[PDB]
Amino acid sequence: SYNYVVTAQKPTAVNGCVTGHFTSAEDLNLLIAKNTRLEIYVVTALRPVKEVGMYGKIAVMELFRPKGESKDLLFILTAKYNACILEYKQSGESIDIITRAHGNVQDRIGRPSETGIIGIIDPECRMIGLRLYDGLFKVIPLDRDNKELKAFNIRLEELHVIDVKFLYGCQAPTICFVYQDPQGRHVKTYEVSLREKEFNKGPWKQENVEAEASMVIAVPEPFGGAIIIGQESITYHNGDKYLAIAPPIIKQSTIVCHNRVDPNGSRYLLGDMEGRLFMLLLEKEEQMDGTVTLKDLRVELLGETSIAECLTYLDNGVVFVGSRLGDSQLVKLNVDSNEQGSYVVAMETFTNLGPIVDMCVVDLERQGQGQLVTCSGAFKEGSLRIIRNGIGIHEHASIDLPGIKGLWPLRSDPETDDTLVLSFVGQTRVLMLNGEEVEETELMGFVDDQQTFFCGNVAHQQLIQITSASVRLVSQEPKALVSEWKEPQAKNISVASCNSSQVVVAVGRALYYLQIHPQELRQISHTEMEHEVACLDITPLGDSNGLSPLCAIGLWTDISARILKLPSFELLHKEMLGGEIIPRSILMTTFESSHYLLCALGDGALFYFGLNIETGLLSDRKKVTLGTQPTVLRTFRSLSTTNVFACSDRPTVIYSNHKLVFSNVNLKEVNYMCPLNSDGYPDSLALANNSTLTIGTIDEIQKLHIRTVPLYESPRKICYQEVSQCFGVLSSRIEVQDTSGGTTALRPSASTQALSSSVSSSKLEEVEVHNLLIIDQHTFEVLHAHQFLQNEYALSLVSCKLGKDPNTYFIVGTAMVYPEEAEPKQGRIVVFQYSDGKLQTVAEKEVKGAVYSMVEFNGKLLASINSTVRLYEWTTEKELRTECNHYNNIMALYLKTKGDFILVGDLMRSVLLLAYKPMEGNFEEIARDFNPNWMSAVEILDDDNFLGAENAFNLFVCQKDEERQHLQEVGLFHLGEFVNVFCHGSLVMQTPTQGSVLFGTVNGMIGLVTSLSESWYNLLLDMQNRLNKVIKSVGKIEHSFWRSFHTERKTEPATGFIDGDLIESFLDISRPKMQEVVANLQYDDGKREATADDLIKVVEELTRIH
Amino acid sequence: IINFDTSLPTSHTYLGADMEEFHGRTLHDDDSCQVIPVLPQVMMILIPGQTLPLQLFHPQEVSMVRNLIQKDRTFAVLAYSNVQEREAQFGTTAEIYAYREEQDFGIEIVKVKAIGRQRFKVLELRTQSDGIQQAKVQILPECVLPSTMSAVQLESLNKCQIFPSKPVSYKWWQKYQKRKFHCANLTSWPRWLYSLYDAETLMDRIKKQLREWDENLKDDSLPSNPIDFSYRVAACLPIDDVLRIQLLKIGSAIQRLRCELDIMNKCTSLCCKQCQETEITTKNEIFSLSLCGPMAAYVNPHGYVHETLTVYKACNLNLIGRPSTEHSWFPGYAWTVAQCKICASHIGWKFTATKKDMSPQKFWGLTRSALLPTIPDVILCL
Amino acid sequence: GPIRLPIVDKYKDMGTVVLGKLESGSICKGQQLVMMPNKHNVEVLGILSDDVETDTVAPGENLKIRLKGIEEEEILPGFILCDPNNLCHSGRTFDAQIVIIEHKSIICPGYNAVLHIHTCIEEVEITALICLVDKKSGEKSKTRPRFVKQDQVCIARLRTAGTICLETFKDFPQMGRFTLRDEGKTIAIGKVLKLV
Ligand SMILES: O=C1CC[C@H](N2Cc3cc(CNC(=O)C(F)(F)c4ccc(Cl)cc4)ccc3C2=O)C(=O)N1
Ligand SMILES: [Zn+2]
Hints:
The complex is a heterotrimer of chains A (about 1100), B (about 375) and C (about 200).
Chain A: E1 3-9, E2 16-20, E3 29-34, E4 37-42, E5 47-53, E6 58-64, E7 73-78, E8 82-90, E9 95-104, E10 118-121, E11 127-131, E12 138-141, E13 161-166, E14 174-181, E15 184-192, E16 199-201, E17 215-218, E18 226-229, E19 234-237, E20 244-245, E21 255-260, E22 267-272, E23 276-285, E24 293-304, E25 308-313, E26 318-323, E27 328-333, E28 344-350, E29 356-362, E30 371-376, E31 383-390, E32 393-400, E33 406-410, E34 419-424, E35 427-434, E36 437-440, E37 454-455, E38 462-466, E39 470-475, E40 481-486, E41 495-498, E42 502-507, E43 510-517, E44 520-523, E45 533-537, E46 550-555, E47 560-565, E48 570-576, E49 583-591, E50 594-601, E51 605-612, E52 617-625, E53 632-638, E54 641-647, E55 652-655, E56 661-664, E57 672-676, E58 684-688, E59 692-698, E60 703-710, E61 714-721, E62 726-736, E63 744-745, E64 756-757, E65 766-776, E66 782-787, E67 792-794, E68 798-800, E69 809-816, E70 827-835, E71 838-847, E72 854-857, E73 860-865, E74 868-874, E75 880-887, E76 894-896, E77 901-905, E78 911-917, E79 922-929, E80 935-940, ...
Parallel strand pairs in A: 64-66
Antiparallel strand pairs in A: 1-86, 2-3, 3-4, 4-5, 6-7, 7-8, 8-9, 10-11, 11-12, 13-14, 14-15, 15-16, 17-18, 18-19, 19-20, 21-22, 22-23, 23-24, 25-26, 26-27, 27-28, 29-30, 30-31, 31-60, 32-59, 33-34, 34-35, 35-36, 37-38, 38-39, 39-40, 41-42, 42-43, 43-44, 45-46, 46-47, 47-48, 49-50, 50-51, 51-52, ...
Chain B: H1 8-11, E1 20-21, E2 33-38, E3 51-56, H2 59-70, E4 74-79, E5 90-102, E6 109-127, E7 133-139, H3 170-180, H4 191-195, H5 199-211, H6 218-221, H7 226-235, H8 241-249, H9 253-266, E8 269-272, E9 279-282, E10 295-299, E11 305-311, E12 317-319, E13 333-340, E14 346-353, E15 362-367, E16 371-374
Antiparallel strand pairs in B: 1-5, 2-7, 3-6, 4-5, 5-6, 6-7, 8-9, 8-16, 10-11, 11-15, 12-13, 13-14, 14-15
Helix pairs in contact in B: 5-7, 5-9, 7-9
Chain C: E1 4-11, E2 17-21, E3 33-35, E4 40-47, E5 62-68, E6 80-82, E7 91-100, E8 112-117, E9 120-133, E10 152-164, E11 177-182, E12 185-192
The complex binds the ligand O=C1CC[C@H](N2Cc3cc(CNC(=O)C(F)(F)c4ccc(Cl)cc4)ccc3C2=O)C(=O)N1 and zinc ion (ZN).
């Protein structure tokens, strides 16, 4: 099997943050590391500059300035022990990051320490200290000629090291750290010999420190020394001086992160584990000029933040709060305590999907393309996120205004549009635009008692209006009617269209051709058509200086789209379409200098052809469905190219790269539109539906839009019950062991603030309470919150129909968790039903074990209980009776099924295949593969290949094809992200790729996986090896080394996968590098030398799956 | 309640005068290919850390051992998977740590004490013209996995993963689980599930069952490394050969510890293997009379190795003859051959104290080969 | 403790000297002793252990011993010196535990062979054999066997040619071990159990 992995949403969590002068010594930079991404901002009273992609998981990131360098330099160390030193270079308009030194600092032997990689840089900028493995201390000298990052180790007597830091104010490279031996926790200092290469006894040491000493902060000059943080005490250490405080305001939670505010070292920031924010304050006294002695240490609570991972003060009192549990914050902290309490105020809020514990795909906007709803965050940062693929719209003004059946912009004075004409049912009005304020005006020469079918500026400084009965032509200089056209028998006009010089209206089955001359409309031709006309267009296409020689038609009964020639009306091409629905709108436009004809049907079908202007031939037809309601086709311009807006129930913007891209628009419904370009709303769009006129600008390319639904409690699982238009979500909130019965909540959450709240039992330290939440698919209000039993843990959730019961139930598998019993001895399976506005508890099943997962298996419910898989049948008496039973060796943690297969896994990579045999009412082991390793989630790709994520952020694929029960190891790939859930589905409309599987991540990254044919995998593998020679890698990390399947014990090359990110970067290199990449390639189309546009058409076909 | 001295049986004092002892240790590199000789008559699945005594009589066996005592002292013990399976695929190395060749009666006899060292996969078997076989083997590595939280730990909480040593308790383990597995809320599973795959927690759960059998101090007797611990418990589990093979095929201590805990809980009854339908003893009567545990391998005067599980009470057994102290594996106790009352198959021996001050005054020694573990209410290793 | 010295060979020199390996107890100069088969008293003169002379000597060493007493030859190998208090058992019939190690067919009662017990060598006949015993278990056989083949253990009664000095195992090791022998081949080895 050969597969394709592509990132669809870059990671959002923040591994770390640091400030410095990296772009220019005059600038102040903010550097954020979103796992395998590096974001470089510039601070103002934030400005994006450059974001780059490391071929590694960023583990250590620090800024520093070597002896004789213009600006600060950046040091990066990846989880695979890649070290590099980076400089910022700007040649004018081309931002590039050049690598100065690089090298792998991995040691052939060693046990990685428990506290993880710790990187430090001495203040003299002479060395780089790293604590990679236990009992050792790798050191890199920072000589000018160390372009290989040659480093050496230094043995350590202390094995269990907590945290280390380079000391300020020492003429020798001095480190200071906390360690733990069986005698307790202590603190020591060492001095490093860069030449003699050993440790010399340091200044001071003070054994028997606080029991929970965890954080070491080096205080710069003049203070010097270090600060020690713990659960109980904040202590100072410099020489024989020993200051120690124990403020009770921090004994309630643990300090996790810190940051220096002022470079002197008097004000420090303290980040809590629950989101609190503290400011440490050091009291100085300047005895004389020179010496500065430390008097006391004070700490104040400043307010609540997002649960912070990294913190950095910026300037003018603003602080960046980088988080991995919730959204990242930009906070301004004042000196005045706010009315609610403390002195913190949020400014901006950066979206963050991590962590993703579960997610499901849903067709929320009726049918069509899928949307993705995740359980994101933890604790008070708990939230649901709704992610849709489409184009955004920046609403500049919304006006309640029903009945709008037409929309046209108008230039009342010769430039830029200034007037908007609105056609209602059998009537017409005119709006005038003075700035951003809209007011009703009248337009002399325009008739305001008829339904307008078209109006707009035309040639010879004139206007026009095509009502149901007339074709009025208005002047601009005095602004009044100059020539009116009607039907000879004064009959009503059916359909009309116009450009700037020609006008072609139609009446019943007859159509007329008019030209726009000064003060005149010269009628020309009037051919009769076989059947009633539906829509026509006279767009001037291309090349022609003003007027078009073609006329596109759609006819009733015949249901034939036709191209006629002007003014002869000679049938240049007839095309018969479906035959049950009449056409509703037609349009001729051109994309990327290619000439297409479009035509929409009343049922929402959309045909697009290829047009030969001189020949009138409509060929290479292709059809796509956009919505159930009728469609209207309109042309507009954005980014100096002409797009096509398709108004309907599912609005769609058509653009383009010689491949039409139908992109959903993030809007409810749009019936009519027109491009507006005014003095107050420039280069914008005017939208109109049944009740609203909306004006605003539109983005250029479709991204991912994310709607946050905060829950203020940790969500756990999620499923979609469509027949009720609601979501079922498992959640857990934290309460505290209180007086009397206890269990008083912390804060108002989504389970305490539900509409109707149920429970499972009355009252007849931290403690977790689990809930089943019912959430409306449209409002996202908590409709109901079921609270499970005391000491009950909700593990699984699934919404399905069972047996021959038409009711769709919510099924939840639980497990009783008492702290004295290690393995849970009993759990339950509950079957809820959400009818109207109630949650009826339909049935229960007391089970002697946990229920780690469930799945709907061919109308029957299949559940896992410890090491047992049990199949349940749904009775006619509304109960669960057992049909089968199957024991295993493995704890049946993971459960996925396709057809009659069943794939069972556990936390130990162990995988089982099971098959339902109806003629026996039992199961049979089909295959297995045991290779002990930590596994986070699995999924079934097809009947023979199975995907999973193992330890060290990897992926793998097993394959079926006696000893035909062995699963082979056919796919490996180091994704660099902790996959946490797989689910089928896509985020694009309904063939190089086969299948589609999305997945979430702890870092919030959303990726996709699909299968490929051997022909493409062979070619695209050649594509990879060709791009690796060309594309400049940050830190000079080998791509093959990055994607190599990694464990602590083994490291094999990746196979059976394709880094789609690398393949997609083929469209970002310059044009010569493309021709450089295609150095004599054998491309196949039924073989020759391949070009650059040969692979662009290939890669663009791959970018259209996410 | 007892006073025997659990250190006596492990010494195998019945073998006689102190043997020559070796201090050196030989360990082969992981995945390396090695050719190691196989002893023709050894019928056992040896697990690493288990002591194996042997009495070799045949000159071909004696000659091969004299050469081995001069080289690496390591022989291969093939683990036979099936009864009629000619080819062996797995096995365990045995390192001779004590030996003695004696010309007593007039026949050269060689007594040896070996210990299981490294597991291997059999690649080839070559029989020499002498009957001693050589095994081309691949040393199977011991797969050590990191903490389950290592790939899902927050760098800010790294300095919190170290805990100060525990007091020699119920409240402490609750705080251990909460702190080590705090970052479990970033995954699909709760803390209590990760606890089920934590070596330290699993080892503390096993100790709770080993303590029910012996008043042994956890501090020393039981090793602290899960690898060594997992193998030590497997050696004293009274399971059949098919189950013992499955445990040896397990490369992870975690998988081994969980599978052992499930065996210790599921299989409570021990029936006669020949009958299958005759209860002999129960797990409630199992107790450890040797530092190795309730079951250890011992050699009879003719070199037959018996893994003998010591139990307080047994039923449905008839005693043939009178007690004897000759070659007693538990010095101070006399043995009486015990056969099954139904099928008359030899199940083991009853041990009766020779001195009135000894406690227990009587117990039964059952040979693992004769017993079959049964689940109340084929056993499957979880 | 008790003393046992299986006599290997005597030779007339000085008064009278005797050879053997001294297996039980210590032997002092002039320590009165006895000779078991004929109950002859005898007093020590000279203890020439190794080539050196020592007044007393402990078990293990290889002693030449000058004997003062009514012993001037007419002492055969397979006699023993004995502590006069608890001296050695004797006779000519005894039970023993005999493992057959080499024999092409079957041995049955009335089988004639040689019997090597310490220094003594005297022809022997197995009068009747009592009970087989299984090697795996230790199970004393239910019925009397009519014969025993190779690689098999049993307990049997044995009559030597005439009056020899036997000692049961458990009581004494070196004198309680023996090897049946025929055609120079070693055919069985045996520990002695009872004394008939
Ligand atoms: O605690 C225990 C429980 C009992 C267990 N035993 C003793 C035993 C003795 C014999 C028959 N003896 C002999 O065969 C002999 F050893 F007594 C012998 C006699 C003469 C000669 Cl020449 C050589 C050996 C057969 C089998 C066993 C057996 O399985 C054990 O070993 N220690
Ligand atoms: Zn039986």
